Structure 1
Amino acid sequence: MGKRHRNLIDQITTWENLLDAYRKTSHGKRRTWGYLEFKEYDLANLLALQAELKAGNYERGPYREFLVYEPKPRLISALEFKDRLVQHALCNIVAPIFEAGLLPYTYACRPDKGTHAGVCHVQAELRRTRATHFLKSDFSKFFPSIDRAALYAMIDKKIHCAATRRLLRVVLPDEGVGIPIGSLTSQLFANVYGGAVDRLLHDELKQRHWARYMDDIVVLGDDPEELRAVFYRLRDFASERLGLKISHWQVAPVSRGINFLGYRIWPTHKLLRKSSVKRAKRKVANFIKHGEDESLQRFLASWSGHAQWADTHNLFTWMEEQYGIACH
């Protein structure tokens, strides 16, 4: 491989790729009005979508914008199955040419790196280096602040294909601040966007012990003054370059626990977030006093996987004391 990338809409619109995009788009959504209305003439619908992409006549359908409010209110704009399919067709050829350049410590929406690989890299990189302190930051409204202009200085430093560059600009117009949260194309463009601060930590600033998950950035250190300087340098950059205000940040010692990704992470141990605990607690509590104790076993087995890492037992005892049911 070596730069350029100047004929991607040929691969984007390859039948074997749109079938992958169709499979990807339908994976898990096979109970939904979108798939069931599409599944009817599926291979025919892929043909009028291929011929709409391959012609340069694809127009992204309007987001239906509701607001899920669960952990906090977020304006989640969903997309038609045809549009999520086109995003999947783009992020099959366009994603692995951005996700390749992402430094190894970015653990968001990438294959084989995830929520856990992050909490493990932070714990690990906490044991080695024997970090005395740690800077944790977070970007205010990350998706509703991505410049959608300076983003298209990175999505146009890699795509080079004058047609794919126009399909990315039909999916995400290159106008003003605001990447739609609730879009595959968006998770990618945000990890790429946040990857700018990765290069300013790793390349400039020469910070080698760090981790980013989308907007959350841990930077384990040894002095709490260099880490504060690194943040100031990171904040000044992400503000004057990327238009991202830092909502919360903390240069705490590795003693306060690194609230990273649903785990408070010490060098030695690593609990969970109290919110996840209480959410699951109340979710089970409701499920019991609603009338489901067989799907609870499916959930319990699920959450026993999310908690097998954490040093829990601060819920399973609690559950067993509230209802007596044999958790573990």
Structure 2
Amino acid sequence: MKLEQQIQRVILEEAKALIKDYHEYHNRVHLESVRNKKRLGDSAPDKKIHRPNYWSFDKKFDPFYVKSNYKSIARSIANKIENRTYLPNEPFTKDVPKPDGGIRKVSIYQIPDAAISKLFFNRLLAKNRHRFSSFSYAYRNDRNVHFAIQDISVDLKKNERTFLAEFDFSDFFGSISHSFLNEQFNENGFYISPEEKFIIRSFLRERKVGIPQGTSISLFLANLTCWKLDQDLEREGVKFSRYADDTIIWSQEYSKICNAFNIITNFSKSAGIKINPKGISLLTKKGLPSEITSKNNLDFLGYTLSVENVSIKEKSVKKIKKQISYILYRNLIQPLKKTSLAGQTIPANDRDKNFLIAICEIRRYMYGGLSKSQIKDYLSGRSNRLYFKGIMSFYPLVNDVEQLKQLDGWIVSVIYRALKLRCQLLSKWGYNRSHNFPFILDREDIVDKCSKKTIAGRKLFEIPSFLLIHKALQKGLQESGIEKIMNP
């Protein structure tokens, strides 16, 4: 297997994946434009197929061009690597404002460069996995981060007291001396081949100071750079997880966390660049008090972890509520708030197509489109597999029944209120439908009525419930684990 053939395969697969994503993009845009025409009538805006802007910044950001000449690109890249002259082209960088007031600098390399990065740095990560720490993730959406969450959750539940602290490694990775990185190349038993060292040094030479964040090379270079920090924190006995440019360190002892702070600074001085906490707190039971500055629950990647349970962060709950409310608004209010309702089917005959579309959109967003019979069949044993899609799939570890029950109530209440406003708007337009099915139900009846309603032999009006899919998620976690339910 020659290197040129390997580069060919990698570049071609990356290009094909991007092409497939764009094809599905424009197909989705067309299907949605057809549905939106049906929804907003003549007011429906016209389709607008966009192509990513960075496709034009360089021709090699474009999947279609790279697929046009991936053989020549791979040929030249292999020759440049063999002659040790290869240097990656500049990536597209956009500065996104971090909510904490910082700046996260994304880097989108060109398809050839990204392909080479994956080919080599996935190999280096696989070859050196046992030298790296446990809970080290390059992205804050990585599916494996929940393992770290699980650990902290378990610890929080068991430990009488859990001291925690947080750190921002953003500036560390923005400006870390590449000479320090190079000093780590032959330490901690890392198996880095000479050609791999050339590719690492080439991607670093393309940069000037710091490691590119959010890239195929980020995880490996971070682990290689922070290997001594990880070793010192493990020798102290604290547990830690690095996700992107954030690090959480928790322990059962105050002295241990203090010494961890000391370790981070010894590492900061040795690296030439400082690491600053977001800082330190104690997590205890809600009833019991604290001696040091403390909070009841930590917020860790969309989870509010407490000594009593794991729940969804209020920001994440707000996002869920935003999506559900906008589903209902888009399908049941926005069309009726236009200047003309021409081409928009007005509900009649005890049938609202808009309400079915909205309930189904909410069901897709939450369950992934599952029926309550499917979920109950999984919960009973009748069925041995239930696909776990939707928003709850991203919160597999939630065990807060009260939160999900409250969100159930909120879903029902918002359905009632939006339907009432839809009736009011319809009546303004001159279509009395209050007595009809979708607008006559009282709130304390919606669920029941919609549960009984059937169309095409399938109950497509049932109001989706977070608690049912939570039951299923708990069973699926106890039967398959986290990794098997966050992707099929």
What is the rounded CA distance, in whole Å, between the counterparts of 2:220 and 2:207 in structure 1? Answer: 18
Which amino acid counterpart does residue 265 of structure 2 have in structure 1? D
Q: CA deviation at 1:95?
A: 1.9
Structure 2 counterpart of 1:197: 229
Q: CA deviation at 1:105?
A: 4.1
Which amino acid counterpart does residue 92 of structure 2 have in structure 1? R
Q: Do the aligned partners of residues 214 and 295 (structure 1) sit closer, same or farther apart at CA in structure 2, a change above 3 Å counting?
A: same
Q: Is the 8 A contact 1:136 1:251 kept in 2?
A: yes
**2:301 aligned counterpart, secondary structure:** coil
- Pairwise mapping of residues 109-124 of structure 1 onto structure 2 (< 5 A)? 114-124=144-154
CA RMSD between the two structures: 3.4
Using CA pairs under 8 Å that are at least 6 residues apart, name the structure with larger relative contact order, 1 or 2: 1
Does structure 1 residue 247 correspond to structure 2 residue 277? yes
Q: In structure 1, which of residues 155, 167, 170 is the aligned counterpart of residue 199 of structure 2?
A: 167
Does structure 1 residue 65 correspond to structure 2 residue 93? yes
Structure 2 counterpart of 1:7: none
Structure 2 counterpart of 1:134: 163
Q: Do the aligned partners of residues 187 and 22 (structure 1) sit closer, same or farther apart at CA in structure 2, a change above 3 Å counting?
A: farther
Does structure 1 residue 305 correspond to structure 2 residue 393? yes
Q: In structure 1, which of residues 71, 90, 100 is the aligned counterpart of residue 120 of structure 2?
A: 90
Q: Do the aligned partners of residues 248 and 70 (structure 1) sit closer, same or farther apart at CA in structure 2, a change above 3 Å counting?
A: closer
Does structure 1 residue 321 correspond to structure 2 residue 413? yes
Which amino acid counterpart does residue 222 of structure 1 have in structure 2? Q
What is the rounded CA distance, in whole Å, between the counterparts of 2:284 and 2:7 in structure 1? Answer: 46
Structure 2 counterpart of 1:183: 215
> What TM-score results when the alignment is normalised by the length of structure 2?
0.55
What runs of 5+ residues in structure 2 fail to find an aligned partner?
23-54, 56-61, 286-295, 332-356, 369-389, 417-461, 466-488
Structure label with greater radius of gyration: 2
Structure 1 counterpart of 2:311: 271
Q: Is the 8 A contact 1:146 1:244 kept in 2?
A: no
Structure 1 counterpart of 2:348: none
Structure 2 counterpart of 1:35: 63
**2:217 aligned counterpart, secondary structure:** helix
What is the rounded CA distance, in whole Å, between the counterparts of 2:19 and 2:154 in structure 1? Answer: 36
Q: Do the aligned partners of residues 136 and 246 (structure 1) sit closer, same or farther apart at CA in structure 2, a change above 3 Å counting?
A: same
What is the rounded CA distance, in whole Å, between the counterparts of 2:143 and 2:131 in structure 1? Answer: 14
Q: Do the aligned partners of residues 96 and 141 (structure 1) sit closer, same or farther apart at CA in structure 2, a change above 3 Å counting?
A: same
Q: Do the aligned partners of residues 219 and 37 (structure 1) sit closer, same or farther apart at CA in structure 2, a change above 3 Å counting?
A: same
Q: CA deviation at 1:116?
A: 0.8
What is the rounded CA distance, in whole Å, between the counterparts of 1:160 and 1:308 in structure 2? Answer: 36
> Which shifted more, 208-217 or 260-269?
208-217
**2:90 aligned counterpart, secondary structure:** coil
Which amino acid counterpart does residue 118 of structure 1 have in structure 2? A
Q: Is the 8 A contact 1:18 1:89 kept in 2?
A: no
Q: Is the 8 A contact 1:52 1:58 kept in 2?
A: yes
Q: Is the 8 A contact 1:194 1:214 kept in 2?
A: no
**For residues 14-42 of structure 1, what are the alpha-carbon distances to aligned partners after superposition, in whole Å with 9 as ceiling and x for unaligned?**
73576256536754663355322223344
Q: Do the aligned partners of residues 327 and 152 (structure 1) sit closer, same or farther apart at CA in structure 2, a change above 3 Å counting?
A: farther
**For residues 164-197 of structure 1, what are the alpha-carbon distances to aligned partners after superposition, in whole Å with 9 as ceiling and x for unaligned?**
2121111122975432223221233224434432
Q: Is the 8 A contact 2:118 2:216 kept in 1?
A: yes
Q: Is the 8 A contact 1:118 1:213 kept in 2?
A: no
Q: CA deviation at 1:102?
A: 0.9
Which amino acid counterpart does residue 281 of structure 2 have in structure 1? V
**For residues 293-316 of structure 1, what are the alpha-carbon distances to aligned partners after superposition, in whole Å with 9 as ceiling and x for unaligned?**
466544333212123422341544
What is the rounded CA distance, in whole Å, between the counterparts of 2:98 and 2:364 in structure 1? Answer: 21
Q: Do the aligned partners of residues 126 and 210 (structure 1) sit closer, same or farther apart at CA in structure 2, a change above 3 Å counting?
A: farther
What is the rounded CA distance, in whole Å, between the counterparts of 1:67 and 1:194 in structure 2? Answer: 25
What is the rounded CA distance, in whole Å, between the counterparts of 2:77 and 2:408 in structure 1? Answer: 50
